[PDB]
Amino acid sequence: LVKNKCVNFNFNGLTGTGVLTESNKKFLPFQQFGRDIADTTDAVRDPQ
Amino acid sequence: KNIDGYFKIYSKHTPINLVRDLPQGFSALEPLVDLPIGINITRFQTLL
Amino acid sequence: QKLIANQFNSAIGKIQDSLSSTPSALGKLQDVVNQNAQALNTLVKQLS
Numbered sequence: 001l002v003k004n005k006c007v008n009f010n011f012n013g014l015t016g017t018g019v020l021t022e023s024n025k026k027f028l029p030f031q032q033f034g035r036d037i038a039d040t041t042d043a044v045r046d047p048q
Numbered sequence: 049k050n051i052d053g054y055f056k057i058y059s060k061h062t063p064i065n066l067v068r069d070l071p072q073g074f075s076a077l078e079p080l081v082d083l084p085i086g087i088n089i090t091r092f093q094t095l096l
Numbered sequence: 097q098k099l100i101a102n103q104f105n106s107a108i109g110k111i112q113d114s115l116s117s118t119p120s121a122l123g124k125l126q127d128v129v130n131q132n133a134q135a136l137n138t139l140v141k142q143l144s
């Protein structure tokens with residue numbers, strides 16, 4: 001695991017670049033990865 | 049639902065208190081299980 | 097002088113409530129702000 005550093009990530013089926021840190025917008029059990037306006041990924045839950 | 053060789057099943061428990069069995073609404077459906085089998089279906093039948 | 101001062105003070109006091117109660121008074125700035133935001137949203141959405 002890497003946090004608070006500009007890294008490249010490859011989660012389950014989604015790939016992108018950018019820093020990733022712990023947040024507070026908790027997910028529901030069925031959720032997998034978040035989103036925001038314009039359908040751009042901005043929040044991903046840890047599979048681990 | 050049957051799409052792309054998948055059988056997605058969504059369920060939700062909802063208590064009721066009105067005379068009508070179906071309430072007014074304001075309810076959603078949360079995914080519970082997923083079944084990825086590709087089989088063409090044209091009819092369904094319940095079991096009692 | 098006293099009557100004119102009273103009228104001026106009354107009008108200055110009333111215009112605050114006129115701005116607060118009327119919702120469309122501040123439209124001409126929210127209009128351009130919303131137009132720019134909408135243009136940016138349409139731009140970013142064009143990626144997909």
Ligand SMILES: *[C@@H]1O[C@H](CO)[C@@H](O[C@@H]2O[C@H](CO)[C@@H](O)[C@H](O)[C@H]2NC(C)=O)[C@H](O)[C@H]1NC(C)=O
Pocket residue numbers: 048
């Ligand atoms: C899955 O990843 C977790 C992340 O560390 C492993 O650690 C366990 O995590 C669970 C909750 O996610 C805790 O209840 C356990 O106490 C953790 N284990 C230990 C030894 O502290 C977990 O082991 C991983 N799953 C498997 C099957 O290994």
Ligand SMILES: *[C@@H]1O[C@H](CO)[C@@H](O)[C@H](O)[C@H]1NC(C)=O
Pocket residue numbers: 086087088
């Ligand atoms: C039946 O299912 C197969 C997938 O196993 C699919 O390719 C086909 O289009 C479906 N319909 C028919 C008429 O075969």
